[PDB]
Design a protein around this ligand. Structure first.
Ligand SMILES: O=C(O)c1csc(CCNC(=O)c2cc3nc[nH]c3cc2F)n1
Length: 167
């Protein structure tokens, strides 16, 4: 049993809810919240901008030190950093950004990072301002992630479309 509430069950291990991931993280304090990161960990907008704002920019400060030491992530890659006031840990995962021309096949590699964590609160990778089709992102998620993933979808209209079209 875990503390996630109000989710629709899509499969054995994937659950979904119309929710603001920031508010959901603040209430659950999950072990892992996933950020929709870019390779530079520049958390300017979308999910990343919202998560970072909720940490009062502490996420960005920590991220800048990480990049100064380690250099950029790979598209499809990830790193584990602090969850600050939102979670124990934040898994920063880089989905391909279609608006940068990045190969959508890397979306599966991005979701594979979730398998290193038994339970996660996450957004749909490469959705929103990353330009991919969220229906496709949900399909890749379901077909790739084997650990228990709680997906937060901010837009109610999109949430309803994702549920109604799910196979
Ligand atoms: O419906 C979805 O989940 C969806 C559609 S596009 C996309 C990526 C961009 N997300 C955001 O800008 C975003 C900003 C927030 N500010 C406060 N809480 C937020 C949650 C967010 F998700 N997510």
């Amino acid at each position: 049993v875990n503390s996630f509430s109000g989710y629709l069950k899509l499969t054995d291990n994937v659950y979904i809810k119309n929710a603001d991931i920031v508010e959901e993280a603040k209430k659950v304090k999950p072990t892992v919240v996933v950020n929709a990161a870019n390779v530079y960990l520049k958390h300017g907008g979308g999910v990343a901008g919202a998560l970072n704002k909720a940490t009062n920019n502490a996420m960005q400060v920590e991220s800048d030190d990480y990049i100064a030491t380690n250099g950029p992530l790979k598209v499809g890659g990830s790193c584990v950093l602090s969850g600050h006031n939102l979670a124990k840990h934040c898994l920063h995962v880089v989905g391909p950004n279609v608006n940068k021309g990045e190969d959508i096949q890397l979306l599966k590699s991005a979701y594979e990072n979730f398998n290193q964590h038994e339970v996660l609160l996450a957004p749909l990778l490469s959705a929103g301002i990353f330009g991919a089709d969220p229906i496709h992102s949900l399909r890749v998620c379901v077909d790739t992630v084997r650990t228990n993933v709680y997906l937060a979808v901010f837009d109610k209209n999109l949430y309803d479309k994702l549920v109604s079209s799910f196979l």
